[PDB]
């Protein structure tokens, strides 16, 4: 376990042959209101475009997943709600340890980059047409809706 770089949101290490990127865990929030899912978009320099995502962010020190979810929902959309843990996933276990905890948000109330309310069916249609790209969180949100929220 030799480190080649220790940055702000990630560290680059090596375990003999495997290249490993240590990354802070994250959260994502699925929220549906009047048939529209709460998507967000922001410039993502790593990909050069703004994919359709859902409120999400890194868990801060001292924070647990639930608290981070509450914070990201409020900071990115100015909303609060009743949160329920759904499931988790490793974004790409072949090279990074980033783990994402997904929550469902209900009974949204306004308490205070781009907020994109859109029907999941439309988000899927646009993607299939090549009009918009998805982040893992965005796709998970869309599939979750089609599977359990209709």
* Residue number with CB closer to Zn ion (39 or 124): 39
**Of these, 33, 71, 74, 88, which contacts its own copies (CB under 8 A)?**
88
Rounded Cα distance, 11 and 116, in Å: 32
User: Sign of the C-alpha dihedral, residues 47, 50, 52, 56?
Assistant: positive
Which element (helix H / strand E) includes 122?
A: helix 120-128
**Of these, 91, 108, 116, 118, which contacts its own copies (CB under 8 A)?**
91
Residue appearing with tokens 């475009």:
49
Of 41-49, 50-58, 86-94, 108-116, the segment contacting Zn ion by CB under 5 A is 50-58
For residue 59, give every residue at least 6 positions away whose Cβ sits within 8 Å of its Cβ, in sequence order, or none: 24, 25, 26, 27, 65, 68, 101
Residue appearing with tokens 């929030």:
29
**Of these, 20, 57, 67, 74, which contacts Zn ion (CB under 5 A)?**
57
* Residue number with CB closer to its own copies (61 or 94): 94
Which residues of the chain form contacts with its own copies (CB under 8 A)?
4-5, 7-10, 12, 15, 18-21, 23, 26, 44-48, 51, 53, 58, 87-100, 124, 127-128, 133-136, 138-140, 143-144, 146-148
Which residues of the chain form contacts with Zn ion (CB under 5 A)?
57
């Amino acid at each position: 376990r030799t480190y080649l770089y220790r940055g702000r949101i990630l560290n680059l290490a090596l375990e003999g042959r495997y290249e490993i990127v240590e990354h802070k865990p994250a959260v994502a929030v699925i929220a549906l209101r009047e048939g529209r899912m709460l998507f967000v978009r922001q410039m993502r320099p790593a990909v050069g475009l703004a994919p359709l995502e859902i409120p999400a962010g890194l868990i801060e020190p001292g924070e647990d997943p639930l608290e981070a979810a509450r914070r990201e929902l409020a900071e990115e959309t100015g909303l609060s709600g009743d949160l329920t843990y759904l499931f988790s996933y490793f974004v790409s276990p072949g090279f990074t340890d980033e783990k994402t905890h997904v929550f469902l948000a209900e009974n949204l109330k306004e308490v205070e980059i781009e907020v994109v309310w859109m029907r999941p069916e439309e988000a899927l249609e646009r993607h299939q047409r090549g009009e918009v790209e998805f982040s893992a969180t965005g796709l998970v949100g869309v599939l979750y809706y089609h599977a359990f929220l209709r």
